[PDB]
Amino acid sequence: PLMVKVLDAVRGSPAINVAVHVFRKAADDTWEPFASGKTSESGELHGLTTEEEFVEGIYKVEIDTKSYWKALGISPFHEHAEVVFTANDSGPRRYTIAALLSPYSYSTTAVVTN
Amino acid sequence: PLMVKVLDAVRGSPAINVAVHVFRKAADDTWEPFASGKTSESGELHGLTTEEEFVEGIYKVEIDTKSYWKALGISPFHEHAEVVFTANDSGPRRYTIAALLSPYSYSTTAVVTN
Amino acid sequence: PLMVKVLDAVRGSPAINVAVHVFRKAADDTWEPFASGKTSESGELHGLTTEEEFVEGIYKVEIDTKSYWKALGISPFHEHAEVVFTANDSGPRRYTIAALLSPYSYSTTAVVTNP
Amino acid sequence: PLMVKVLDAVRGSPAINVAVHVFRKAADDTWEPFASGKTSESGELHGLTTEEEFVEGIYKVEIDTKSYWKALGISPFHEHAEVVFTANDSGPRRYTIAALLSPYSYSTTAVVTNP
Numbered sequence: 001p002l003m004v005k006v007l008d009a010v011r012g013s014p015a016i017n018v019a020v021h022v023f024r025k026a027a028d029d030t031w032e033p034f035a036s037g038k039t040s041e042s043g044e045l046h047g048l049t050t051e052e053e054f055v056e057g058i059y060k061v062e063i064d065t066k067s068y069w070k071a072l073g074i075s076p077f078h079e080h081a082e083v084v085f086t087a088n089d090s091g092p093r094r095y096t097i098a099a100l101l102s103p104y105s106y107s108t109t110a111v112v113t114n
Numbered sequence: 115p116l117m118v119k120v121l122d123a124v125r126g127s128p129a130i131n132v133a134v135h136v137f138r139k140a141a142d143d144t145w146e147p148f149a150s151g152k153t154s155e156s157g158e159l160h161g162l163t164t165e166e167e168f169v170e171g172i173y174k175v176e177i178d179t180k181s182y183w184k185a186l187g188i189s190p191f192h193e194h195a196e197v198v199f200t201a202n203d204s205g206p207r208r209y210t211i212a213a214l215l216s217p218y219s220y221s222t223t224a225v226v227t228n
Numbered sequence: 229p230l231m232v233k234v235l236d237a238v239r240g241s242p243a244i245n246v247a248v249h250v251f252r253k254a255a256d257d258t259w260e261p262f263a264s265g266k267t268s269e270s271g272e273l274h275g276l277t278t279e280e281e282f283v284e285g286i287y288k289v290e291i292d293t294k295s296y297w298k299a300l301g302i303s304p305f306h307e308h309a310e311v312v313f314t315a316n317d318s319g320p321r322r323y324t325i326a327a328l329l330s331p332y333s334y335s336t337t338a339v340v341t342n343p
Numbered sequence: 344p345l346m347v348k349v350l351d352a353v354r355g356s357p358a359i360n361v362a363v364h365v366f367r368k369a370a371d372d373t374w375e376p377f378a379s380g381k382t383s384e385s386g387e388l389h390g391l392t393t394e395e396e397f398v399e400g401i402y403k404v405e406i407d408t409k410s411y412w413k414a415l416g417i418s419p420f421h422e423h424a425e426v427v428f429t430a431n432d433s434g435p436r437r438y439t440i441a442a443l444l445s446p447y448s449y450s451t452t453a454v455v456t457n458p
């Protein structure tokens with residue numbers, strides 16, 4: 001129900017071995033851990049959740065962009081990239097959060113399909 | 115060896131049924147037709163060329179963004195989106211040209227892999 | 229020393245009246261409110277801070293994109309766009325945080341200059 | 344009435360000294376040269392045209408991104424970034440064409456205002 005795809009705009013490649021942490025907003029307004037992983041060789045992270053666990057709510061996808069750039073010997077601007085959104089059942093059922101990274105910039109989009 | 119992927123930043127979806135025309139630069143500096151198609155339900159166009167035909171050279175991928183927006187009843191800025199690049203054999207072998215469309219803006223990136 | 233510029237990729241215009249909240253990470257790892265404002269008719273927000281006040285730290289620039297799209301009567305994907313960065317850690321710099329908004333997407337960039 | 348602004352997403356800076364060529368589609372469907380220039384230290388190029396000269400038409404703004412990256416001693420993917428649009432077809436407007444550059448990617452947006 002939830003996939004993350006990360007691309008590198010400097011090298012023209014998937015962004016491999018990027019740490020990604022997903023959080024769900026709790027009733028007290030704290031962010032609690034939900035799912036995490038490292039992007040694959042294809043820059044993707046699948047297997048984060050199941051339909052059962054992925055209930056409506058506010059989620060945060062934190063992509064560790066600073067460590068990614070540092071590992072490539074490149075000095076970056078951001079601490080991380082943050083994508084915060086509401087999962088809504090009246091919308092399509094599969095969510096892809098994509099991000100396109102540069103050292104001083106990033107783009108993100110959502111592809112929400114049925 | 116060549117794929118095109120198009121996404122819609124307004125609807126959060128693949129951009130479906132978008133016309134895409136590929137041209138190769140000729141020795142006289144004219145653009146000659148090379149391959150074309152319409153994006154699928156997943157916003158992708160595969161099958162454009164084969165490894166045999168996709169030789170080094172300068173290529174232009176023209177995405178008919180104006181017709182796409184007009185069909186959705188939305189007034190857009192650009193006539194089309196143009197992506198012009200050199201295919202180089204000393205680089206990885208598969209090229210994905212991706213574009214992310216808005217009415218007054220677009221993003222494009224290349225994912226070049228082995 | 230800190231400016232925010234926001235554009236609307238749907239309308240081809242500045243994004244006007246966008247609320248922006250800036251936080252600074254405190255000693256105790258919480259996010260302290262630092263400054264806030266709204267973009268002008270030119271999509272710009274200046275006057276957030278001074279070079280005295282804008283010390284080294286980890287800053288969070290929260291751009292209230294959902295409130296923007298909903299005030300336009302549109303239902304967008306993101307809650308906000310957050311831009312988090314270390315500032316002034318090699319001395320004072322001037323920062324422009326720019327963002328380009330669509331209902332299901334945004335991009336952000338930084339322009340950092342040394343006065 | 345026509346301005347071009349270019350930023351560098353690698354350095355977090357204006358993209359300076361970027362060559363830009365503007366064309367206008369002629370009666371015979373060819374691309375006639377219209378104006379050209381280079382971005383300044385602020386990544387901006389003004390003074391391309393006048394409101395008299397900038398008549399209705401289909402215009403092509405070619406940003407020479409490959410020459411930029413190669414002058415920096417970097418090998419980029421694209422030959423250039425081309426921005427093609429109809430202008431002034433409901434009367435005169437002011438156009439800003441902005442671009443944000445990386446070696447394998449770019450984004451472009453337009454800001455259109457009615458003076």
Ligand SMILES: Nc1ccc(/C=C/c2cc(Br)c(N)c(Br)c2)cc1
Pocket residue numbers: 005098099100107108109119210212213214221222223225
């Ligand atoms: N499988 C597959 C391959 C490539 C993509 C490209 C996504 C994409 C994301 C962002 Br954000 C921008 N700005 C751009 Br241009 C493109 C998606 C799925």
Ligand SMILES: Nc1ccc(/C=C/c2cc(Br)c(N)c(Br)c2)cc1
Pocket residue numbers: 233235324326327328335336337348441442443450451452
């Ligand atoms: N004066 C001034 C300063 C900064 C800007 C930024 C424009 C801008 C263009 C793109 Br294309 C993207 N993707 C992003 Br983000 C931002 C414009 C005018």
